Amino acid sequence: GSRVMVIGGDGYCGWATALHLSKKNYEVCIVDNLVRRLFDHQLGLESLTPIASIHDRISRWKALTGKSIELYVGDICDFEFLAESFKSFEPDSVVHFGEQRSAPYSMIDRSRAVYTQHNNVIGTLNVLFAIKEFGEECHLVKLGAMGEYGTPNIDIEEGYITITHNGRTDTLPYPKQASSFYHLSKVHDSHNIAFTCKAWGIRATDLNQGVVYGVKTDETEMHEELRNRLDYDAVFGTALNRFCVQAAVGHPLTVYGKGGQTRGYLDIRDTVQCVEIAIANPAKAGEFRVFNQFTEQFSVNELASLVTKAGSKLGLDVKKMTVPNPRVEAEEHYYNAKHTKLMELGLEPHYLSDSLLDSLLNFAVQFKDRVDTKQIMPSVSWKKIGVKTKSM
Amino acid sequence: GSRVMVIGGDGYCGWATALHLSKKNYEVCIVDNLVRRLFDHQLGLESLTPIASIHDRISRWKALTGKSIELYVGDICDFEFLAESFKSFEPDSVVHFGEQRSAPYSMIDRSRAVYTQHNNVIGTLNVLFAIKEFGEECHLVKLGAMGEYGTPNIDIEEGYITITHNGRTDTLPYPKQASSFYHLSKVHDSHNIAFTCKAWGIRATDLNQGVVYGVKTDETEMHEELRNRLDYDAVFGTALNRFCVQAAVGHPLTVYGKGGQTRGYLDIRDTVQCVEIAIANPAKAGEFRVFNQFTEQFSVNELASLVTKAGSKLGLDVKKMTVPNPRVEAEEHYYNAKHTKLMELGLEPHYLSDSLLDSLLNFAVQFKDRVDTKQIMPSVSWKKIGVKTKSM
Ligand SMILES: NC(=O)c1ccc[n+]([C@@H]2O[C@H](COP(=O)([O-])OP(=O)(O)OC[C@H]3O[C@@H](n4cnc5c(N)ncnc54)[C@H](O)[C@@H]3O)[C@@H](O)[C@H]2O)c1
Ligand SMILES: NC(=O)c1ccc[n+]([C@@H]2O[C@H](COP(=O)([O-])OP(=O)(O)OC[C@H]3O[C@@H](n4cnc5c(N)ncnc54)[C@H](O)[C@@H]3O)[C@@H](O)[C@H]2O)c1
Ligand SMILES: O=c1ccn([C@@H]2O[C@H](COP(=O)(O)OP(=O)(O)O[C@H]3O[C@H](CS(=O)(=O)O)[C@@H](O)[C@H](O)[C@H]3O)[C@@H](O)[C@H]2O)c(=O)[nH]1
Ligand SMILES: O=c1ccn([C@@H]2O[C@H](COP(=O)(O)OP(=O)(O)O[C@H]3O[C@H](CS(=O)(=O)O)[C@@H](O)[C@H](O)[C@H]3O)[C@@H](O)[C@H]2O)c(=O)[nH]1
């Protein structure tokens, strides 16, 4: 074999997924403009671990396994490029990871908020049109976000909710409440895709994924040049990964506000597994499937405690600090998000364990010398966002 | 006064509104790039009635009343232009009509679907940033769309719905189900605005307006050069206006599919009244108000009957025809949309009457010679939409 086009395949989730699918014997190609690497240069950021170029990454995989991952370098917002890539590769499935995924980045200034929504929304529209025009039966596996749902006072369902209102019943799309221009762009994406499923017969699966943690997967650990990126800065870094790196360098864990913010989380190893499951068990024509993709819920404070305890076993004497929250969000809220669709399809989760934290912490300690502590504290305010293009 | 910036002020709803607000003694300016006029030239379309240039329109209003409506010609997607216009005028309220509003246009091809979403979503984001940066207390009166709600099997509320799910209760944004790339762009707009109200304290009112009908308003009838446009083509024309023009030229009424499609409608005279009411009674800081802006619900078949009966009194011998529906939508569905917020604020509606239909029909007959019958039948398919840029 089945042919899979991995848009955003040079990224954190995409690279791990591309290698996994190739190992599982799918014919794979990567479509990426590598703009994520440009963001690092422009903002002065750097991955914890050094990563190889996309060309060397692909070359190494071929040298080790003999398998060739095709590469198409370009911006999917450029339809000519996307169309040519689609016609050249002829994918049976498309996994779309190719979007600006940072909430902080989307809040830097007007230019970055506009770039985020244009890049994400238009890019996704182009993907839908390419599928419709060049391979209508192609299954779209889209990376959405648990953040689309926000933090309502009721249980969060997997994309749909059956409601009885004024004596009548119906199953409707779950109300969306995004808290950043980035999260909003995903809401827009999901609404756009749902429409094309009904109007054109497109088959798609929206993976509303929670926060991913970890850096190792069976494939990326086979050689140093296959190593994945591990972000710890306040722009692209996420909660758990950030805390582990902070613990390793002796920086107090950065708890934003009260720390009651609760979200779904999952090991990067489960990210690749879930995507493969979605590909192996495709949506039917005209069906818009929605899976809540995470394995466990944790509050920020809970993560802080787990990392502190794990760090103690390594003599890190982890400390915690309360950082005035740069974001506008509920710091204490109800949270009970449903997640059984993937489990029903055979998901065998890697729940957060002492072993994972021990491994991740030791990894951070190993490359502690490469950590730029100046990028640990957040400097992007949700409320103070302006129109002048900022230079970090 | 109070200063009002009318974005899209050269358009159908915008022009009538700009004149009305000026008459009501608000200081008014119009921000428009006049791209709507370019669409007419590009697609070979033309208004039923000849309209004057925006410059002559504004000049005539000044000659008649002595009042000056300031004009800023530019694309709001160009932030430099929008910022300069905002700083120059210093609006207390902004009414945003400046978007690509045709569902058929948004379905012509990939380029037009992408243009629709980019123009609308990015333009609206720029407006939000301009308000935040140059006049945070400025009230945004946004034109949304009843189409955002789709046609669910339950009552449609005014933006929000209180639901009890699994033993818990909460009031959430009403589920959105748009049926075109244009309607989808409005859903995106509304979600984006709601976020900025909470994050930045923006005050906004989303006017989810139904289908507008009519061509006359007290102000536009004061002189021929103030005349508003009346669209009847299958791209920009809407149901009732289209039927009246069809009846006048002896063309069978174009009922798409079964004709059970039900929507909310309102006289253009109520459009201007509702906008003024929203401006005179502004939303509070951080509040995202949502009003369902229409006065009565009608099914396509119901409109066909009303126009036939009205046409009979003028000896038009109106006929009806069933056109294979170019759109993907429910042709028989439940529809009970709530609309009381505007009435509670003092709306004095002009319900559809024999007098209105008689007047509108006679108007169409008056300019029947200018009707290009080749543009009456729809040629844009929701399902056959392609990637090649079309030339109509
Ligand atoms: N990282 C997480 O914790 C997490 C959690 C939930 C969902 N996801 C989702 O998974 C997807 C990938 O996330 P990630 O962490 O791997 O991101 P990333 O930034 O590491 O990877 C995204 C990749 O997409 C590429 N890209 C972006 N825009 C592109 C365009 N216009 N054309 C071609 N390529 C483009 C970038 O260059 C990059 O290589 C995103 O949708 C994201 O929101 C990630
Ligand atoms: N006409 C209806 O029946 C109806 C019904 C419900 C809601 N509305 C809404 O009211 C608004 C106006 O509708 P209309 O019928 O007057 O449309 P229209 O096309 O006659 O007017 C829109 C105006 O906006 C201007 N414009 C578009 N993009 C612009 C940009 N990037 N920068 C500056 N100016 C721009 C166009 O040139 C045009 O003059 C739309 O949001 C529409 O969806 C209209
Ligand atoms: O040092 C930190 C980092 C984060 N947080 C808090 O932890 C929560 C999660 O934040 P995060 O930065 O780890 O993740 P988020 O911004 O939500 O974004 C990431 O996780 C999202 C999953 S979700 O929100 O959709 O569930 C994906 O969509 C995004 O692409 C990905 O970047 C937030 O309340 C945040 O304020 C802290 O308290 N301290
Ligand atoms: O000759 C015609 C024209 C229309 N219809 C049907 O009548 C209904 C209304 O169509 P329309 O073209 O009059 O209006 P619509 O496309 O919904 O769009 C217009 O009305 C919308 C109000 S609403 O959908 O948001 O309620 C606004 O948002 C849009 O900007 C404006 O162009 C549809 O089911 C359509 O298929 C016919 O049967 N015959």
Nearest ligand to the C-alpha atom of residue B79: 2
Helices (H), B281-325: 300-312
- Rounded distance, CA B195 to CA A186, Å? 14
Q: Is the CB of A292 under 6 A from ligand 3?
A: no
Domains and CATH numbers, chain B: 1-209+268-294 (3.40.50.720), 210-267+295-378 (3.90.25.10)
**A147 to chain B, closest Cα gap in Å:** 13
Degrees, nearest 5: CA angle B89-B94-B95: 130
Q: B370-392 burial, b if ≥16 CB within 10 A, otherwise e? A: ebeeebbebebbbeebebeeeee
* Ligand 1, residues at Cβ distance < 6 Å: A 8, 10-14, 32-36, 75-77, 97-101, 119, 123, 143, 145, 209, 211-212, 238
Ligand 1 centroid – CA A214 distance (Å): 16
Query: Does A165 contact B168 at a Cβ distance shorter than 8 Å?
Result: no
CB count within 10 Å of CB B73 equals: 14
Q: Is the CB of A238 under 6 A from ligand 3?
A: yes
Nearest to A166 among B121, B155, B164 (CB): B155
Query: Does B122 contact A118 at a Cβ distance shorter than 8 Å?
Result: yes
Q: Which tokens sit at B382?
A: 């929701």
**A23 to chain B, closest Cα gap in Å:** 34
Q: Are B208 and B141 in contact (CB under 8 A)?
A: no
Sign of CA dihedral A180, A181, A184, A189: negative
Partners of A194 on chain B (C-beta within 8 Å) are: 177
What's the distance, CA B316 to chain centroid? 29
Query: Does A122 contact B126 at a Cβ distance shorter than 8 Å?
Result: no
Partners of B133 on chain A (C-beta within 8 Å) are: 386-387
Cα dist. A86→A91, A131, A136, A240, A288 in Å?
Answer: 7, 8, 12, 36, 22
Ligand 1 centroid – CA A99 distance (Å): 5
Is B163's Cβ below 8 Å from some Cβ in A? yes
Tokens 């189409």, residue located: B147
> Got the DSSP string for A5-42?
EEETTTSHHHHHHHHHHHHTT-EEEEEE--HHHHHHHH
Show Cβ contacts of residue A245 under 8 Å, excluding neighbours closer than 6 positions: A48, A230, A232, A237, A364, A371, A376
Ligand 1 centroid – CA A154 distance (Å): 29
Strands A27-32 and A70-73: parallel
CB count within 10 Å of CB A392 equals: 12
Q: Is the CB of B327 under 6 A from ligand 4?
A: yes
List beta partners, residue A161.
Answer: A172
Q: Is the CB of A8 under 6 A from ligand 3?
A: no
Is A375's Cβ below 8 Å from some Cβ in B? no
Degrees, nearest 5: CA angle A46-A48-A50: 80
Show Cβ contacts of residue B183 under 8 Å, excluding neighbours closer than 6 positions: B103, B145, B147, B148
Q: Phi and psi dihedrals of A71, rounded to 5? A: -125, 130
Is B154's Cβ below 8 Å from some Cβ in A? yes
Is B161's Cβ below 8 Å from some Cβ in A? yes
| Resolution of the experimental structure, in angstroms | 1.8
Count the helices and strands in chain A (H runs, E runs): 12, 14
Partners of B154 on chain A (C-beta within 8 Å) are: 163-166, 168-170, 172
Q: Which tokens sit at B26?
A: 């608000």
- Classify burial at B153, counting beta carbons within 10 Å of its beta carbon; exposed 0-12, middle 13-18, buried 19 or more: middle
Partners of B180 on chain A (C-beta within 8 Å) are: 195
- Asked how this structure was determined, the answer is X-ray
Nearest ligand to the C-alpha atom of residue B209: 2
DSSP reduced 3-state for B272: helix
Choice from B5, B12, B69, B243 to test ligand 2 binding pocket (greatest atom count within 8 A of CB): B12
Q: Is the CB of B147 under 6 A from ligand 4?
A: yes
Nearest to B125 among A114, A169, A200 (CB): A114
Which helix (H) or strand (E) segment is A293 a member of?
Answer: strand A288-293
DSSP label at residue B177: -
CA dihedral A255, A256, A257, A262 (to 10 degrees): -90
Q: Are A207 and A291 in contact (CB under 8 A)?
A: yes
Residue of B nearest to A191 (CA): B184
DSSP reduced 3-state for A365: helix
Sign of CA dihedral A85, A86, A88, A93: positive
- Rounded distance, CA B101 to CA B236, Å? 8
**B300 to chain A, closest Cα gap in Å:** 21
- Rounded distance, CA A60 to CA B307, Å? 72
**B171 to chain A, closest Cα gap in Å:** 9
Partners of B165 on chain A (C-beta within 8 Å) are: 154-155, 161, 163
CB count within 10 Å of CB B184 equals: 30
- Rounded distance, CA A269 to CA A216, Å? 7
- Classify burial at A170, counting beta carbons within 10 Å of its beta carbon; exposed 0-12, middle 13-18, buried 19 or more: middle
Q: Are B369 and B323 in contact (CB under 8 A)?
A: no
Greatest extent of chain B over all pairs of C-alpha atoms, in Å: 64
Strands A168-173 and A160-165: antiparallel
Q: Are A32 and A8 in contact (CB under 8 A)?
A: yes
Q: Are B217 and B306 in contact (CB under 8 A)?
A: no
Q: Closest Cα to atom 33, ligand 4: which residue?
A: B261
Ligand 4 centroid – CA B378 distance (Å): 12
> Got the DSSP string for A201-264?
--EEEEEEE-EEE-S--TTGGGSGGGPPP---STTT--HHHHHHHHHHHTPPEEEETTS--EEE
Ligand 4 centroid – CA B101 distance (Å): 10
The angle that helices A12-23 and A54-65 make with each other, rounded to 10 degrees, is 20
DSSP reduced 3-state for B103: helix
Q: Are A24 and A6 in contact (CB under 8 A)?
A: no
Nearest to B125 among A117, A164, A382 (CB): A117
- Rounded distance, CA B344 to CA A113, Å? 37
Greatest extent of chain A over all pairs of C-alpha atoms, in Å: 64
Q: Are B115 and B105 in contact (CB under 8 A)?
A: no
Sign of CA dihedral A48, A52, A58, A63: negative
Strands A262-267 and A211-213: parallel
Q: Are A125 and A193 in contact (CB under 8 A)?
A: no
Show Cβ contacts of residue A61 under 8 Å, excluding neighbours closer than 6 positions: A19, A22, A67, A69, A219, A226
